[PDB]
Design a protein around this motif. Structure first.
Motif, PDB file in Angstrom:
ATOM      1  N   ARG A 151       8.148 -12.628 -24.776  1.00  0.00           N
ATOM      2  CA  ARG A 151       7.187 -13.644 -24.370  1.00  0.00           C
ATOM      3  C   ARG A 151       7.555 -14.265 -23.022  1.00  0.00           C
ATOM      4  N   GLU A 152       8.827 -14.642 -22.858  1.00  0.00           N
ATOM      5  CA  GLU A 152       9.312 -15.234 -21.618  1.00  0.00           C
ATOM      6  C   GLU A 152       9.121 -14.264 -20.469  1.00  0.00           C
ATOM      7  N   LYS A 153       9.513 -13.009 -20.695  1.00  0.00           N
ATOM      8  CA  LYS A 153       9.412 -11.979 -19.659  1.00  0.00           C
ATOM      9  C   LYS A 153       7.964 -11.764 -19.196  1.00  0.00           C
ATOM     10  N   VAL A 154       7.046 -11.596 -20.149  1.00  0.00           N
ATOM     11  CA  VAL A 154       5.619 -11.442 -19.840  1.00  0.00           C
ATOM     12  C   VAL A 154       5.085 -12.673 -19.080  1.00  0.00           C
ATOM     13  N   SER A 155       5.388 -13.874 -19.576  1.00  0.00           N
ATOM     14  CA  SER A 155       4.983 -15.110 -18.907  1.00  0.00           C
ATOM     15  C   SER A 155       5.488 -15.160 -17.459  1.00  0.00           C
ATOM     16  N   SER A 156       6.756 -14.809 -17.250  1.00  0.00           N
ATOM     17  CA  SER A 156       7.358 -14.951 -15.939  1.00  0.00           C
ATOM     18  C   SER A 156       6.671 -14.065 -14.930  1.00  0.00           C
ATOM     19  N   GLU A 157       6.311 -12.852 -15.338  1.00  0.00           N
ATOM     20  CA  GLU A 157       5.624 -11.912 -14.453  1.00  0.00           C
ATOM     21  C   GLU A 157       4.152 -12.243 -14.282  1.00  0.00           C
ATOM     22  N   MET A 158       3.500 -12.653 -15.366  1.00  0.00           N
ATOM     23  CA  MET A 158       2.093 -13.054 -15.300  1.00  0.00           C
ATOM     24  C   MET A 158       1.897 -14.255 -14.386  1.00  0.00           C
ATOM     25  N   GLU A 159       2.849 -15.182 -14.417  1.00  0.00           N
ATOM     26  CA  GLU A 159       2.846 -16.367 -13.541  1.00  0.00           C
ATOM     27  C   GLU A 159       2.992 -16.068 -12.037  1.00  0.00           C
ATOM     28  N   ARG A 160       3.689 -14.984 -11.687  1.00  0.00           N
ATOM     29  CA  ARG A 160       3.752 -14.534 -10.283  1.00  0.00           C
ATOM     30  C   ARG A 160       2.424 -14.091  -9.718  1.00  0.00           C
ATOM     31  N   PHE A 161       1.624 -13.422 -10.547  1.00  0.00           N
ATOM     32  CA  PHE A 161       0.424 -12.755 -10.078  1.00  0.00           C
ATOM     33  C   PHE A 161      -0.854 -13.463 -10.480  1.00  0.00           C
ATOM     34  N   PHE A 162      -0.867 -14.067 -11.675  1.00  0.00           N
ATOM     35  CA  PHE A 162      -2.062 -14.751 -12.191  1.00  0.00           C
ATOM     36  C   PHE A 162      -1.691 -16.099 -12.797  1.00  0.00           C
ATOM     37  N   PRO A 163      -1.201 -17.032 -11.976  1.00  0.00           N
ATOM     38  CA  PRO A 163      -0.725 -18.322 -12.515  1.00  0.00           C
ATOM     39  C   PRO A 163      -1.808 -19.089 -13.272  1.00  0.00           C
ATOM     40  N   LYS A 164      -1.420 -19.810 -14.327  1.00  0.00           N
ATOM     41  CA  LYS A 164      -2.334 -20.742 -15.021  1.00  0.00           C
ATOM     42  C   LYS A 164      -2.901 -21.765 -14.050  1.00  0.00           C
ATOM     43  N   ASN A 165      -2.050 -22.237 -13.136  1.00  0.00           N
ATOM     44  CA  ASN A 165      -2.453 -23.073 -11.995  1.00  0.00           C
ATOM     45  C   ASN A 165      -2.997 -22.176 -10.875  1.00  0.00           C
ATOM     46  N   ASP A 166      -4.301 -22.280 -10.625  1.00  0.00           N
ATOM     47  CA  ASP A 166      -4.975 -21.488  -9.592  1.00  0.00           C
ATOM     48  C   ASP A 166      -4.951 -22.166  -8.214  1.00  0.00           C
ATOM     49  N   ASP A 167      -4.034 -23.122  -8.020  1.00  0.00           N
ATOM     50  CA  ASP A 167      -3.933 -23.863  -6.750  1.00  0.00           C
ATOM     51  C   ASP A 167      -2.517 -24.396  -6.478  1.00  0.00           C
ATOM     52  N   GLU A 168      -1.535 -23.493  -6.461  1.00  0.00           N
ATOM     53  CA  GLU A 168      -0.162 -23.863  -6.084  1.00  0.00           C
ATOM     54  C   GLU A 168      -0.032 -24.005  -4.563  1.00  0.00           C
TER      55      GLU A 168
ATOM     56  N   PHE B  90      -2.804 -13.319  -4.355  1.00  0.00           N
ATOM     57  CA  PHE B  90      -2.455 -12.144  -5.154  1.00  0.00           C
ATOM     58  C   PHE B  90      -1.939 -11.100  -4.187  1.00  0.00           C
ATOM     59  N   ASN B  91      -0.730 -10.635  -4.453  1.00  0.00           N
ATOM     60  CA  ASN B  91      -0.069  -9.697  -3.583  1.00  0.00           C
ATOM     61  C   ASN B  91      -0.170  -8.323  -4.227  1.00  0.00           C
ATOM     62  N   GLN B  92      -1.134  -7.537  -3.752  1.00  0.00           N
ATOM     63  CA  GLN B  92      -1.376  -6.188  -4.274  1.00  0.00           C
ATOM     64  C   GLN B  92      -0.144  -5.293  -4.130  1.00  0.00           C
ATOM     65  N   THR B  93       0.574  -5.416  -3.008  1.00  0.00           N
ATOM     66  CA  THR B  93       1.770  -4.576  -2.793  1.00  0.00           C
ATOM     67  C   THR B  93       2.875  -4.898  -3.822  1.00  0.00           C
ATOM     68  N   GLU B  94       3.121  -6.187  -4.031  1.00  0.00           N
ATOM     69  CA  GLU B  94       4.085  -6.633  -5.052  1.00  0.00           C
ATOM     70  C   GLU B  94       3.646  -6.292  -6.472  1.00  0.00           C
ATOM     71  N   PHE B  95       2.346  -6.413  -6.742  1.00  0.00           N
ATOM     72  CA  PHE B  95       1.738  -5.917  -7.993  1.00  0.00           C
ATOM     73  C   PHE B  95       1.990  -4.426  -8.190  1.00  0.00           C
ATOM     74  N   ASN B  96       1.671  -3.627  -7.181  1.00  0.00           N
ATOM     75  CA  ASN B  96       1.941  -2.182  -7.207  1.00  0.00           C
ATOM     76  C   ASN B  96       3.409  -1.844  -7.499  1.00  0.00           C
ATOM     77  N   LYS B  97       4.328  -2.589  -6.878  1.00  0.00           N
ATOM     78  CA  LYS B  97       5.785  -2.390  -7.040  1.00  0.00           C
ATOM     79  C   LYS B  97       6.208  -2.696  -8.466  1.00  0.00           C
ATOM     80  N   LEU B  98       5.743  -3.830  -8.999  1.00  0.00           N
ATOM     81  CA  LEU B  98       6.030  -4.171 -10.406  1.00  0.00           C
ATOM     82  C   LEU B  98       5.428  -3.170 -11.386  1.00  0.00           C
ATOM     83  N   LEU B  99       4.168  -2.788 -11.163  1.00  0.00           N
ATOM     84  CA  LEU B  99       3.491  -1.788 -11.984  1.00  0.00           C
ATOM     85  C   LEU B  99       4.310  -0.506 -12.019  1.00  0.00           C
ATOM     86  N   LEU B 100       4.727  -0.040 -10.849  1.00  0.00           N
ATOM     87  CA  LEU B 100       5.463   1.207 -10.758  1.00  0.00           C
ATOM     88  C   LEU B 100       6.820   1.122 -11.443  1.00  0.00           C
ATOM     89  N   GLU B 101       7.557   0.049 -11.187  1.00  0.00           N
ATOM     90  CA  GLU B 101       8.859  -0.125 -11.811  1.00  0.00           C
ATOM     91  C   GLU B 101       8.753  -0.088 -13.345  1.00  0.00           C
TER      92      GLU B 101
END
Lengths: 68, 68, 68, 68
Positions: free
Chosen positions: A51-68, C2-13
């Motif tokens: 859960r932590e791992k999924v959250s941590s990665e999901m937060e990088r790309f699709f944060p719950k906060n859409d205005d950081e 949203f960083n497509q390149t970083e997304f691609n890198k994570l997806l691939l890894e």
């Protein structure tokens, strides 16, 4: 001829089916006597860690906060 | 230089190979004595549940009905 | 953002690491006594079947023949 | 209507969750008596091999050197 839509459909099917299957595989193995009372592989502990791992990665790309 | 086509090919190979392998892994583990007659991990039950999950996600993105 | 390149890198890894791991998991389970001499789960048979599956899907999207 | 952002989110969740789960599955199976002292499936050996594989593919698409 490369069909991006058909590619997307196959990609999605594979990853969704794999995840659903892996969730069951994890459950089965969590119950194997050879890891009973081994804390790293206690189901609830594993589920939390996942859960932590999924959250941590999901937060990088699709944060719950859409205005950081 | 980033080759999207080669990226796509690697992505597809990995996910298709993984799914094919995971299907076999699930089958093997479904047969382990430590889960025999445990209903959550009975193969037919697992396959059905996986089917529902794949359908539910496929229907969000690529519905059988192309005009909702 | 949203960083497509970083997304691609994570997806691939994730997918490359998963496949490498799943190949080992399959190997380990193929050796479990509870499936010894069960033909569906004999390693060489499984590897062949996986090969066919990967080929069949790769041929839809990235055929060896680039002019069908 | 196909939502690429929602597709991306589902794709990412599945692959990240799968990898996290597969890492645990590998750990559990590495500890099964039926492969103890079998060098191919010794955890440290497997982790190294996986590392090489991930590096080799990551280097094709996202090299540490951004100017080859």
């Amino acid at each position: 001829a490369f069909n991006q839509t058909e590619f997307n459909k196959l990609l999605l099917e594979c990853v969704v089916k794999t995840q659903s299957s892996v969730a069951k595989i994890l459950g089965i193995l969590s119950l194997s006597p050879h890891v009973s009372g081994n804390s790293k592989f206690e189901y609830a502990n594993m589920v939390e860690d996942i859960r932590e791992k999924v959250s941590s990665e999901m937060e990088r790309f699709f944060p719950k906060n859409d205005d950081e």
